[PDB]
Amino acid sequence: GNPLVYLDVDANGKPLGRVVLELKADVVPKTAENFRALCTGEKGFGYKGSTFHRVIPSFMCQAGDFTNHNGTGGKSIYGSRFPDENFTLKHVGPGVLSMANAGPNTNGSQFFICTIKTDWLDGKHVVFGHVIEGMDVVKKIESFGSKSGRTSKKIVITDCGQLS
């Protein structure tokens, strides 16, 4: 069935808890597989030790730039970037997991978790999973953001991996 992955998150060195995510490999297999492999680190690089670098309250929490830590970097398991797989899943509400990008067909490793319904992103960002457990942790992360995206605390993915 669909993979379950986790992110364990710290804020200024203090554990916030675990976010568990279902990846919708049934609908977006290529996009799901990229995220899964980046969680396990099995290609020799991935999310462990990287940060949530842009967090905007009442909108989204963005992470996944493990090369430059500022929103300019990251890479996929396929190459630097890969195409938009499909736009079948929508940004239906809080807990949706979606690919960040720099325009059409520029997926890498950066992703975001929505904290509201972001319907204006439908057809522009590939949705590929959802939070199963840990929305409370996501809400804590959201509370440390600001309108500019700057975080008031350093938010680090201290561990991550695959549960099933």
Residues 6+ apart with CB under 8 A from 80: 108
DSSP label at 21? E
Order the strands of the 111-114 sheet from edge to edge: 52-56, 60-63, 111-114, 96-99, 127-133, 14-23, 4-11, 155-162
Catalytic residue among 18, 69, 81, 101: 101
Q: Is 110 a catalytic residue?
A: no
Q: What are the structural domain ranges in the chain?
A: 1-164
Residues in the chain: 164
The answer to whether residue 125 is catalytic is: yes
> Catalytic site residue 12?
no
CB-based contacts of 68, cutoff 8 Å, min separation 6: 74
Measure Cα distances from 162 to 4, 39, 42, 114 in Å.
6, 7, 11, 21
Catalytic residue flag (residue 62): yes
Exactly one of 121, 128, 130, 144 is catalytic; which is it?
121
Per DSSP, the residues of 29-46 read: HHHHHHHHHHHHTTTS--
Instruction: Determine the 3-state secondary structure of 119 from DSSP.
Output: helix
In sequence order, which residues have a C-beta less than 8 Å from that of residue 146 and are 6 or more positions away?
Answer: 55, 56, 57, 152
Question: Tokens representing 46?
Answer: 């991935």
Q: Is residue 59 annotated as a catalytic residue, yes or no? A: yes
Q: Which one of the listed residues 59, 81, 87, 162 is annotated catalytic?
A: 59
Question: Domain 1-164 classified CATH 2.40.100.10?
Answer: yes
Question: Please, are residues 4 and 151 in contact by the beta-carbon 8 Å criterion?
Answer: no
Q: CA-CA distance, 13 to 36, in Å (whole number)? A: 25
